[PDB]
């Protein structure tokens, strides 16, 4: 009973100012610059990046607990709604607890899947569930293993702050357990795709209280709570739900930049007969598949890393079976504002860059003048580069051998850089007054920058011959 006159328990709370749609918000990073496009030389290739702005906004209900085989949050715990909570390290409230009812979502129990907890508390709650669980085993004695509810999530990685909203997990976690090299994808060197195999066995639901005062014991006056920490910035919450099980986390990382990564990757995953593409096969060489299992009942720090995805597969699947006997650890939960008893949701909002790319393979041109006459060639193309605006800039370049007699069997190669475009070859036979007045023995326009563009002419002044193969 404070002099502030907000003495009644149900009064303090119900009369507590705040905005649910904020008190639990995680306004991400605030980026404001980059460059719409960029090419880059790295080995016998030409990299083309593109920088688009993206804004992934999400409002989660399903919050992931940090210390999987460890930290303990449960149906009843009362946690203030502050930033600590968001970082999976929520402050906690401990006052005298009046009885409550638990209920597990386990199958074939609708009607008898509910116990009471005379003294809401971890050990208490846990044990209860324990007894609850077993009781099931009893009703289902010829079954020791039942499938687990798998929830799939998946996405490439552009930022901690990005993958962190997409998959809905503390970014730190991934950065340690899966070991992410952000700055490598941030520079489009590495391309990462993370897998989210949330294994579910069941949950536990704490029956909603008609009123707050129905939780704390009468001896608990709202003012002790205003004291425990509550405020317009600490609206207490009750864990309305907890889901138990684990989570398989695969990481598909690579060094390529061939636009067909997410492609190859997905093809690989879904294991579609397209994954036998020679191109894919190459993108696969430069890729490492790491898969770990968090949550519980699984040798901590365990981990896999195979170039053969088949190995990642056995992992996942062999983690579907959910033993009813062995302990199931907490991995997800959903609290509720006492006051309005509405579901408490987090506000992840952030802008990030969407890297996009393609790779170009170098090539050279070989000329074969096994001709019974004299000829001059004219090879010209454009080298591409990108300005600060992300615009193409066509630098026109020509072979210094252009406009020059070449006799019975000549030989030369013309090294073209992987950023070569508008490639046109053209051999003109020298029967006439001058260049623009000779007959064309070959003239291919916009030739493709193949491994090798070989132009070979042959023939008689009168009866010329020519061809051009590609690799």
Collapsing DSSP states into helix, strand and coil, what is residue 388? coil
Please say whether the beta carbons of 372 and 408 come within 8 A: yes
Q: Which among 239, 190, 191, 310 has a CA at the least distance from the CA of 79?
A: 239
Question: What is the Cα–Cα distance from 105 to 108, expressed in whole angstroms?
Answer: 9
Cα–Cα distance measured from residue 239 to residue 208, given in angstroms and rounded to the nearest whole number: 10
CB-side neighbour CA atoms (13 Å) of 290: 17
Which tokens is 211 given?
């009123």
Report d(CA 404, CA 460) in Å as an integer.
Answer: 19
Distance between CA 465 and CA 15 in Å, rounded?
93
For residues 357 and 188, the answer to whether their CB atoms sit within 8 Å is yes
**Alpha helices by DSSP H, 150-300:** 160-166, 171-177, 182-185, 222-228, 261-269, 278-285
How far is residue 101's CA from residue 108's CA, in Å, rounded to a whole number?
Answer: 19
Place of tokens 């639901």: 205
Method: X-ray
E-assigned strand segments in 378-463: 380-386, 392-398, 413-416, 420-429, 439-447, 452-460
Resolution (A): 3.0
25 Cβ contact partners less than 8 Å away, ≥ 6 residues apart:
346, 347, 349
Looking up tokens 């009812």 gives 101
Instruction: Please calculate the CA angle 61-66-70 and round it to the nearest 5 degrees.
Output: 125
Domains of the chain, CATH where assigned: 1-24+61-149+200-245+321-344 (3.90.840.10), 25-60+345-361 (3.30.1040.20), 150-199+246-320 (3.40.30.40), 362-471 (2.60.40.1430)
Q: Residue 360: beta bridge partners?
A: 46
Closest CA to 289 of 318, 269, 270, 263: 269
* Tokens representing residue 404 in the block: 């020059």
Widest pairwise Cα distance in the chain: 113
Say if CB 380 and CB 443 are below 8 A apart.
Answer: no
The answer to whether 68 and 168 have CB atoms below 8 angstroms apart is no
Whole-angstrom distance, CA of residue 89 vs CA of residue 205: 21
Total length of the chain: 471
d(CA 2, CA 10): 14
Distance CA 114, CA 102 (A): 5
Task: Say if CB 352 and CB 56 are below 8 A apart.
Answer: yes
DSSP-derived pairing of the beta strands 287-294 and 304-306: antiparallel
24: Cα within 13 Å, side-chain hemisphere: 27
Q: C-alpha angle 157/158/163, rounded to 5°?
A: 55
Backbone phi, then psi, for 301, in 5-degree steps?
A: 55, 5
Tokens for 386, please give them.
């990108």
DSSP string, 96-143: -B--EEEEB--SS-TTT-EEEESS--HHHHHHHHHHHHHHHHHHT-S-
Distances (CA, A) of 55 to 51, 162, 458: 13, 9, 60
Cβ proximity of 245 and 201 under 8 Å: yes
Angle at 65 between CA 72 and CA 165, to 5 degrees: 165
What gap in Å lies between CA 366 and CA 352, rounded to an integer? Answer: 46
Which of these, 99, 96, 94, lies nearest to 79 by C-alpha position?
A: 94
Asked whether the CA dihedral 277, 278, 282, 285 is positive or negative, the reply is positive
**What is the rounded distance in angstroms from the CA atom of residue 76 to the CA atom of residue 65?**
15
Residue 358 near residue 259, CB atoms below 8 Å: yes
CB–CB of 115/102 below 8 Å? yes
CA angle (242, 160, 181) in 5-degree steps: 120
User: Do the beta carbons of residue 204 and residue 241 sit within 8 Å?
Assistant: yes
Beta bridge partners of 39: 48
Angle separating helix axes 278-285 and 261-269, nearest 10 degrees? 100
d(CA 307, CA 385): 35
Cβ atoms of residues 359 and 38 within 8 Å: no
């Amino acid at each position: 009973d404070i002099t502030d006159k907000n003495q009644s328990i149900d009064s303090g709370i119900s009369s507590l100012s705040y905005n649910r749609n904020e008190v639990l918000a995680s306004n991400g990073d605030k980026i404001e610059s980059f460059v719409p496009k960029e090419g880059k030389k790295a080995g016998n290739k030409f990299i083309v990046v593109e920088r688009q702005k993206r804004s992934l906004t999400t409002s989660p209900v399903d919050i992931s607990i940090i210390d999987s085989v460890n930290d303990r949050t449960y149906p009843g715990a009362l946690q203030l709604a502050d930033k600590a909570l968001v970082e999976n390290r929520p402050t906690i409230l401990m006052v005298k607890r009046k009885p409550i009812n638990i209920n597990i979502d386990l199958p074939g129990l609708k009607g008898e899947n509910s116990i009471k907890v005379d003294d809401p508390t971890y050990g208490k709650v846990s044990g209860a569930i324990d007894e609850l669980v077993s009781k099931w085993n009893e009703k289902y004695s010829s079954t020791h293993t039942l499938p687990a509810r798998t929830q799939y999530s998946e996405s490439m990685v552009y930022s901690k702050s990005q993958i962190s909203s997409a998959l809905n997990v503390n970014a730190k976690v991934l950065e340690n357990s899966l070991g992410v090299d952000f700055n490598a994808v941030a520079n489009n060197e590495k391309k990462v795709m993370i897998l989210a195999y949330k294994q579910i066995f069941y949950t536990v639901s704490a029956d909603l209280p008609k009123n707050p005062s129905d939780l704390f014991d009468d001896s608990v006056t709202f003012n002790d709570l205003k004291q425990k920490g509550v405020s317009n910035e600490a609206p207490p919450l009750m864990v309305s739900n907890v889901a138990y099980g684990r989570t398989i986390y695969v990481k598909l990382e690579t060094t390529s930049s061939s636009k067909d990564v997410q492609a190859a990757f997905k093809a690989l995953i879904k294991n579609t007969d397209i994954k036998n593409s020679q191109q894919y096969k190459d993108i696969y060489e430069n890729s490492s598949f790491t898969a770990v299992v968090l949550g519980g009942d699984a040798q901590e720090h365990n981990k896999v890393v195979t170039k053969d995805f088949d190995e990642i597969r056995k992992v996942i699947k062999d983690n579907a079976t959910f033993s009813t006997k062995n302990p199931a650890y907490p991995i997800s939960y959903t609290s509720v504002f006492l006051k309005d008893n509405s579901v408490a949701a987090v506000h992840n909002k952030t802008d990030y860059i969407e890297t996009t790319s393609t790779e170009y393979s170098k090539g050279k041109i070989n000329l074969d003048h096994s001709g019974a006459y004299v000829a001059q060639f004219e090879v010209a193309w454009d080298e591409v580069s990108y300005d600060k605006e992300g615009n193409e800039v066509l630098t026109h370049k020509t072979w210094d051998g252009n406009y020059q007699d070449k006799t019975a069997h000549y030989s030369t190669v013309i090294p073209l850089e992987a950023n070569a475009r508008n490639i046109r070859i053209k051999a003109r036979e020298c029967t006439g007054l001058a260049w623009e007045w000779w007959r064309d023995v070959i003239s291919e326009y916009d030739v493709p920058l193949t491994n090798n563009i070989n132009v070979s002419i042959w023939g008689t002044t009168l009866y010329p011959g020519s061809s051009i193969t590609y690799n």
